[PDB]
Amino acid sequence: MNRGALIKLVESRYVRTDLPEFRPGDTVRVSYKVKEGNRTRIQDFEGIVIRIRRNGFNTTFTVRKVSYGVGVERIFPLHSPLIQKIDIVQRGRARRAKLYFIRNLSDREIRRKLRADRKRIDQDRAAERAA
Template sequence: MSDEETKVEEQAPEATPETTEAEATPEAEAPSEETPEEVSTESSHTTKLVDFNELKPGQTIRLHERIKDVSPKGEERERIQIFEGIILTMGGSGMSRTITLRKVSKGFGVEKIYPINSPVVAKIELVKSAKVRRANLSYLKNPKRRFKRKLKETLTALGSQSRKTKKK
């Protein structure tokens, strides 16, 4: 060993039981990562945090997006913006998987494409699910009401089935 390495080893403080106990307590108090579970919101119904593998077209989800704002003073601030919409398509595979969300806001259709594994996506909550027979729901973009009516009928039928099972 060289003289420099021995000096560095001598200067390094040895771990005492007091420091290891103090270091262990903050880790135990730290919240664990979120797992799919039931989460109650301000409204009366509950939503479910969704694992990325469980996402399918036809589901209505609430996606929490991290947005960085810069003030005129140059200070960066991070906030969460919620985008609630229906999943139209899912593209890609593996780490590059994307979802296309659509919602109607103030009479205009808004579509956003999100990479699922992006750090921008904070969390995804499942609001409701519809039984669909296609992987691409681009027919929902059509302004004709009959397609949307079919989807709503399916949603209400699914909702009534879940209510019946809950009462038993």
Template sequence: MIEVVTAEQLERLDPTGEKRTLVSRRSRTHIQPGDVVMVESYTSRTKGTTTRFMGVCIGIYRRGIDTGLLVRNIIERVGVEFRFPVFSPMVKRIEILKRGEGYRRAKLFYLREQPGKAFQLAGLRKQQQQQQQQQQRAAQAAKANRK
């Protein structure tokens, strides 16, 4: 009975199945500890404005409908951690920005004591913005050449 209710809730909260593939161990595109992720979430229930939090995923808690990600970043020399419930209606989207390399643990709590090891994220965001701008310029140039 509980499995049926859980399946119905998952179907209602994630109709496309996108979030389920992000946390599924069997998926090739699943989130792993050490990945740099960006979580975009709504600031209020009216879903007017969103906030983005980018950081290193230091843990995944797979508990069915209560599955969550623990994401950590250094903001103004202070370590900030957020636990995001994956299937919450307040979470708009979760995007993997960069795959983690060389992490062999399920929980990366040791990164709390080694802040320089994984937290050079400001450069990563700037690099992605530059790539997006270059792609937009290339698309505009291709459009201009067609005319």
């Protein structure tokens, strides 16, 4: 037998292929479904993806924003059914896999360390020009 496949088979029914590709250093907006009172709304959340932990189906990416004077990090199952969508908003060129150090950097200092990623930008604009 093969244990991996079977595992991959059980997951196979809950895998997403509509979410966009992205990297740490990018700025992301994640339209996320939320439940409250008593309905369900879609709460956007925009921050630097500082951590994409990978495992095929068990890939989970960490988005960081600074909300009113407080720094917030939050974890997203990359194949969660709660994510309505994900919009890219900037290609940051982090020169590293995990961005644990921008937790202590100033909004300015963070900008020097993640000046835009021109490449993965025109490359984006390269597409987007469908017919």
